[PDB]
Amino acid sequence: MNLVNKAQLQKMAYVKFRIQEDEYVAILNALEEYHNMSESSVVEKYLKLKDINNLTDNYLNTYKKSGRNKALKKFKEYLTMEVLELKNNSLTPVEKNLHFIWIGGQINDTAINYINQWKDVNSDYTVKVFYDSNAFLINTLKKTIVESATNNTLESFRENLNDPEFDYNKFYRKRMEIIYDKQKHFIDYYKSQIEENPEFIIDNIIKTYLSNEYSKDLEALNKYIEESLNKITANNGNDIRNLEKFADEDLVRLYNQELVERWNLAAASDILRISMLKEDGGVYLDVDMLPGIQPDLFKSINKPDSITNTSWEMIKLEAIMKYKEYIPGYTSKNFDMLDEEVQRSFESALSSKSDKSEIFLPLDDIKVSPLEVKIAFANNSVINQALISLKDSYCSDLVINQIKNRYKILNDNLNPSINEGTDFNTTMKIFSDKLASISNEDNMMFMIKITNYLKVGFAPDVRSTINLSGPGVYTGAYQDLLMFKDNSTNIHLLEPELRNFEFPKTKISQLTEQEITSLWSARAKSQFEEYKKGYFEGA
């Protein structure tokens, strides 16, 4: 898997009596100078491979019938192989920063209890729980608007409950039309306030608006802010509103779009996490992840043949929490179904262990290449719930570029659509038609997945987020990397290629109570039925 010589390339691409074209010399010259760059940095080496790939298909484009072409297509696959070799040979320990994010409301104790597990076992990591001191009321604002929209939609359904098809589908359709109006009424208010007074603070804009439009109590909202601030402060809180240099101005603008306009705290955290990893370096984790387990801990308890690998991983964390009680309240529903004898196998192994680092596996030195961002996998697909990146890595810039290029397309078409539209439905049709008019083979799936952006958080089965700030931006970056592109949207990378970037498996437990619970946000008919029930169950 060493990269072919200039001389070896001449052998592959040989055509008897054929003139050496300028475009072909160019490739050979360039490949020679690559092999002369052993002292160069890995990024520099990667950039040279990249210049070489571009020279190659300049030849392939200029001479489409050439007999060199079969060999030159092979060579391009060899260049891609060479990226992996550089990557595997350029590993170095990440900065020992451990990042979490909680924005738009008060951090729960459940989040704090999981975070502490990582804190206790990683003394040599700096734990930073990122928050936004301007924005403790995002969830309050959203919940208020949504509540108001739900209640209005039920009043329009009051005489049509028992029949025929005033059902969950119609509910969400009509409620969303109301949400849109209420949400745009806020955004317009916020936008005008920010024009008038650009020093103005988000939470202050929000309390004024809730106070005036939704009769909310100023005192109560002020109190909530104080409690939220006090709570994160006592828990390694890092205010993003202190930090100076991290702020790419375009990314900042996307962060506040997601935070203040769209109320999508997941997307805002998607944007924030990669930005902090580029600026700080380290390991990013969602607050629902737990440390890996020491491999040897339960190594001698054989899994009952009937139980799945997934259930068994789940059972192991539950055994830890039953007998050590590190997170109080942690479920034991699965663990309690095992035969008495197996429960005691777990109990005994947990008996002889004194400290938490004999139970959980500390991160210690994690090695990573400047060319990559490591990522967690769930179900054969990447998931950005855990990430690893050196400060200022090449691949962190690929991810950030993907986010910006995607949002650009979203905004350039969505902003005019919002401006021309008397309502949700007219805006949507306008937006969809605009997307249709510029769609092609490469961006068609992306265009399809971002069409329902305005419904994100308010309706079921929406996948816009994944394809703007989530998992899709990572597969796009990895394809950019391997294929020497900067625009990947149509993905041909398979799982085994994507596995080259997986987060070290022993160093994370993804199958926690909170995450499994969060995997259930499948359709909630129940919600439309529970909202329904909350109209006979009162005074």
Ligand X SMILES: O=c1ccn([C@@H]2O[C@H](COP(=O)(O)OP(=O)(O)O)[C@@H](O)[C@H]2O)c(=O)[nH]1
254's enclosing H/E stretch is helix 249-256
Strands 282-285, 381-389: pairing kind: antiparallel
Residue 265 has which token pair? 């705290």
Residues in the chain, how many? Answer: 539
263 is in an annotated binding site: no
Q: Which CB, 385 or 475, lies closer to ligand CTS?
A: 385
Q: Which stretch binds ligand X (CB under 6 A): 121-129, 284-292, 293-301, 316-324?
A: 284-292
Other beta carbons within 10 Å of 300: 9
Q: Which stretch binds ligand X (CB under 6 A): 103-111, 401-409, 477-485, 490-498?
A: 103-111
Q: How many chain residues bind ligand CTS (CB under 6 A)?
A: 11
For 21, 92, 132, 133, the CA distances from 396, given in Å and listed in that order, are: 38, 16, 22, 26
Site map 489..518 versus ligand X, x via CB under 6 A? -----------------------------x
Nearest to 206 by CA among 267, 269, 142, 266: 142
CA–CA dist 350, 318 (Å, integer): 12
DSSP β-bridge partners for residue 285:
386
383 binds ligand CTS (CB under 6 A): yes
Nearest distance, CB of residue 385 and Ca ion, angstroms: 6
522 is in an annotated binding site: no
- C-beta of residue 360 within 8 angstroms of C-beta of residue 334: no
366 is in an annotated binding site: no
418 is in an annotated binding site: no
217 is in an annotated binding site: no
Of 30, 265, 277, 430, which one interacts with ligand X (CB under 6 A)?
Answer: 265
288 binds Ca ion (CB under 5 A): yes
Nearest to 507 by CA among 291, 359, 316: 291
CA–CA dist 292, 160 (Å, integer): 52
266 binds ligand CTS (CB under 6 A): yes
Q: Which stretch binds ligand CTS (CB under 6 A): 119-127, 302-310, 320-328, 383-391?
A: 383-391
Footprint of ligand CTS on 421-480 (CB under 6 A): 465-466, 469-470
Of 287, 321, 373, 430, which one interacts with ligand X (CB under 6 A)?
Answer: 287
CA–CA dist 444, 428 (Å, integer): 17
> Side chain identity at 98, as an amino acid letter?
L
518 binds Ca ion (CB under 5 A): yes
**Binding partner of residue 280 among Ca ion, ligand CTS, ligand X, none, CB under 5 to 8 Å per kind?**
Ca ion
103 binds ligand X (CB under 6 A): yes
Summarize as ranges the residues that interact with ligand X (CB under 6 A): 101-105, 139, 265-266, 269, 286-288, 518, 521
